[PDB]
Design a protein around this ligand. Sequence first.
Ligand SMILES: N[C@@H](CC(=O)O)C(=O)O
Ligand SMILES: N[C@@H](CC(=O)O)C(=O)O
Ligand SMILES: N[C@@H](CC(=O)O)C(=O)O
Ligand SMILES: N[C@@H](CC(=O)O)C(=O)O
Lengths: 326, 326, 326, 326
Amino acid sequence: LPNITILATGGTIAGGGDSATKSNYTAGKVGVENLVNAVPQLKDIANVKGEQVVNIGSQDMNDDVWLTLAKKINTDCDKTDGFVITHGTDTMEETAYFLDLTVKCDKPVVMVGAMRPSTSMSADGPFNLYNAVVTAADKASANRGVLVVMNDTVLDGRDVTKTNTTDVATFKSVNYGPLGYIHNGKIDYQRTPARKHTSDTPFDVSKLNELPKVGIVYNYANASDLPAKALVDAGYDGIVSAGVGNGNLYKTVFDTLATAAKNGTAVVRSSRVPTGATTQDAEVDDAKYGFVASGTLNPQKARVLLQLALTQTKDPQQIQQIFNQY
Amino acid sequence: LPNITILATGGTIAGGGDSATKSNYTAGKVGVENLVNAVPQLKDIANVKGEQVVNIGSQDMNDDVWLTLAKKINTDCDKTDGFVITHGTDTMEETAYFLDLTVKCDKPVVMVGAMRPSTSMSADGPFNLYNAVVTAADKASANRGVLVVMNDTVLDGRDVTKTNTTDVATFKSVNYGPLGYIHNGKIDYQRTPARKHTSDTPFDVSKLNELPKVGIVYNYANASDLPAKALVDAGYDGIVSAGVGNGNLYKTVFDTLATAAKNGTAVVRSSRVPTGATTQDAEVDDAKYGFVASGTLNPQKARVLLQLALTQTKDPQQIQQIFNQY
Amino acid sequence: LPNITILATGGTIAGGGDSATKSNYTAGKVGVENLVNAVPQLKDIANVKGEQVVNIGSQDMNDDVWLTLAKKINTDCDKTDGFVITHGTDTMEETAYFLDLTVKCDKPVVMVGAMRPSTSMSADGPFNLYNAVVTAADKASANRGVLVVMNDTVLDGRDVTKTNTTDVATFKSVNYGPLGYIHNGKIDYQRTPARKHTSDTPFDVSKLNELPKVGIVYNYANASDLPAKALVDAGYDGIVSAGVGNGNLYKTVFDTLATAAKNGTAVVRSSRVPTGATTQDAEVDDAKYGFVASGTLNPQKARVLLQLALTQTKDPQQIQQIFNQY
Amino acid sequence: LPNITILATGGTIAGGGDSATKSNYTAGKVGVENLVNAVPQLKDIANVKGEQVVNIGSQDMNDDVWLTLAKKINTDCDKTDGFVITHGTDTMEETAYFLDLTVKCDKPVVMVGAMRPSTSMSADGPFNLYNAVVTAADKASANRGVLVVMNDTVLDGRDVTKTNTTDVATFKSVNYGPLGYIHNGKIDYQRTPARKHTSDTPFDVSKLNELPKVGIVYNYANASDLPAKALVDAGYDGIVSAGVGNGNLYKTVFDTLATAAKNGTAVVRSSRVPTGATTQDAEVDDAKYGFVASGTLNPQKARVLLQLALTQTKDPQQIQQIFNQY
Ligand SMILES: N[C@@H](CC(=O)O)C(=O)O
Ligand SMILES: N[C@@H](CC(=O)O)C(=O)O
Ligand SMILES: N[C@@H](CC(=O)O)C(=O)O
Ligand SMILES: N[C@@H](CC(=O)O)C(=O)O
């Protein structure tokens, strides 16, 4: 049986409430070996080893843990046959894309969480964690970039996103679809991500202890330019605009980010709209203002790429190319 | 034939590019009578009169235009049999909910836009505008609150939202579904919004020239508390948190909004997640920090209600009740 | 606590299997007592009387079980506070609609099943049962017709359909959306069905012990009319066509059915297309051939309403108006 | 500019109607020249040779037109740069899959239709045609199999299906997502089909002028096996079952088909459920009865692959492996 290392970071998959019937719970309580012992059938499909990296609710995920996960996955890559990362659902779509771009290891990395706590009735963590190692063990899962496995479905780390606040079926690749479906511990893979990932990227965080500062501003009717200017005043390396519609900006935010871009801040236009690309050649003349168009990357995903792009260049057209390739 | 007044504000429905084949265009160019003359079959179903309120791209929509629209709709209510508001798609879901809560007139108000410019091949504006007056003319459309009509579908102004950056079918009531479908100028209505609206609300903006200041902060891995503190320092009456998952907050943003709430700022927890409620009784003790849980209201919709709630009270539990009722 | 009668008919919620990690299992085998005992937390919210009606896979469901269920509910209506029906998921949408038209009890009737069998890992049946009882217990669930509660969602019996072959979240009201969502044992209702149901229908199943025979025929490329004739030589009271697109029929099947509509057998146009209404005034002149267009009712749900409409009149224009109101 | 052959078979893209505001219309009436002339902007991107193959409503589509289309494409393959096929939307998913398995040309084959007829307001056919030609013209569209381009989206022939009866956005690859989106006449491809298509299949339609007879039977509550026997006494080479749930069959239909699978006629288990795979190792022992599980192929698409698999072998275990690879 393959060697599968589990890397625990926290989440509701490791959370607990005082009742199987009530909704109140605290996140990231359960230790990693407790998670594994709850699913004794893991011994049938893999030889599992658990390591605790952190134990937090993923609403507190940060640059520090991202670097830690990437380096540990890269350096211990030949010690095991695959990795499963237990993680909170709240930001798992951010971590999954960050590792998608910084993991040089060639063996499958699968992220899992749970939408119901360990203690809840019909908790989903157990079958989720099982199906994650079924995926990390499958040699067919290799060469697909970093994966997210939830609700009997394998999802690529670029497009996967949390679509619903409470539903067990919340995670979807809302733009390009899942890579394959899990039935009875077997996977029928019919897709792979075309965008470049893992060792195919030039992002090397192995010597990095920081990440460039990138923030996100929201656009809406009558939006304040103060969030944008606060990030400008703090000397942020990049700002991601969660625009309206096809990446559009309220006029005052427009004015602020246009000025920051000419004075050196990298500005990426994404959108609050849950599906579809922020394109070029719509209402905003990106070439003129040195803006970068995020494509199908939502704001928090656009932040992941813009941070890593900023470790390579500060030229907007170089960054636009990175946003067209990864 | 019924009297239908069209109130034009701008949008891509009134936008133009130099080619039916290229995607570049400027928004809010076309005058309101030009829109009507493009659809001469309007004369078959209604006696239409057009008035120009503004001509902007709805990414620039603001409190000023909202007040103007509400007052004009309220005071001219008995002059016509129905209203159709042509409007940009980018923020139409915000205007539609604002009018949903401030319109005292009892006759149908229908908002329309277009995802392709007037000049584009297979432009959608014409049939959209037609189907909007078909809806404003139908007496069955009354008593349903303010409506949004797009792609042969009637949508309630609370739940309707822009789901895709470019698709003609972008607008959906992603939580509770549409009220009815349009076929051949007839509507088969099978639903109506349970939440209270229009004259059933206590919101009266008829003497108001301002709206309370409410901003929106985004949550993500490693999020800066600077947007939140900038809005605090400006003395904002309310802040809407676009949380992660079920309304959760990054720890530093948490700290800032908890403090603002105890010192008088109204704080509403919404979510970046495109569907589903930000509930109470999950990970955040709302009663303790005087936070308000937004339910199914997304951040920009939660801003609309919190602004209007702030014209009635500053007590968090009074505001939570408003968020449970409207 | 309220008195809740659980009526058990089988399903994979009562389904077996030799292993929590394998899919091979048998359906409709566990009894209602073992189902109730498996969820002891029912004892705190409701007073559940388990009654076994039959114990079958719902793929083998039929008119008999339908009739007995409708009778049993109407008879026992005033000796309980609500009903829960445990059912297989394959045909749950048809039973739910049948009872949605036949039951005359004005108290909640809620159906529930499970997509994973009792013995599987992370099995969904227990929380499903719990939430179904919560809904049957809720005062607000009355007067909304027969309900289906699955995956934390309350779905009206008319529009609810099985959307996916294996997903725990398979049930959706794909046309008009759900009625409300269940969180922490509380429901927030924001919709009710507009079509007449339960108590305001004219159907009366009380005396009948057999139901007019209606079959279903599938349109496709190079469709054979052998199934369509097979049902008319056997003298079926009516046929429902699973047409292509907007309820259109192939060459052969069109002719066989146009013969039939004139010589007695009432035929109904529905569609194999999972969402959207079969409209009249499209390609097919229903008035010319005496056809009936089903609207949003899919084929298995069109058969339910025709069977029953055939117990009232065989006039096509009489039937169409029942399809426009129920 | 590239040479693009447009092959016209009809559809509501060639459909009539007396009024832009009414739905009554007739299908497959406009010729290919009037279709091309209606989109003069084609002249700038492609060199379109219009060829009329037939002019029919695709509800009346059949094997003949399929065979002639496959032959015509394979024969003329090297006298053009790509093919566009204008088609009705009702059966477009079946033709697209047939050709996806039969054509041996390694140049783009793209199908297109319209949900609104040529003469309607805001008719979608022109931009649809334009974008289909864009896709047929694109160098990157080769080696992805037969494509369907509808509503600015490139969809693989296998998974694409008509999702809604009237929506202009009805076509979706409901299981694995689309291949790419078209904006401003450029496509961003991020997926290709993994299942073997076009040139790497073993099918050869060149000599054949008739196709093994396969019918489809619909499972539901109290299902009649009269359609299922009708096809076996008429000696059909195989039947596809539109089963309930995960490809399950009613009492009667199970027995008739278990008889059949043994006495020659190969039967295939598919499902009436719009999304998700009919799996083996569930409730039905396919190995015991010599059944075949279709996977994600819906019924009309299972019939396409069986018809063709029946021109190769009648062994069930031979057929299942073709269903696991094509
Ligand atoms: N707040 C939790 C939510 C979850 O895990 O589902 C987390 O992300 O850790
Ligand atoms: N930016 C435009 C987009 C549209 O109308 O579709 C607007 O909202 O006015
Ligand atoms: N075959 C099962 C399907 C299920 O319950 O999930 C039934 O309907 O009984
Ligand atoms: N009945 C039409 C449907 C369409 O094209 O929209 C056809 O398939 O030809």
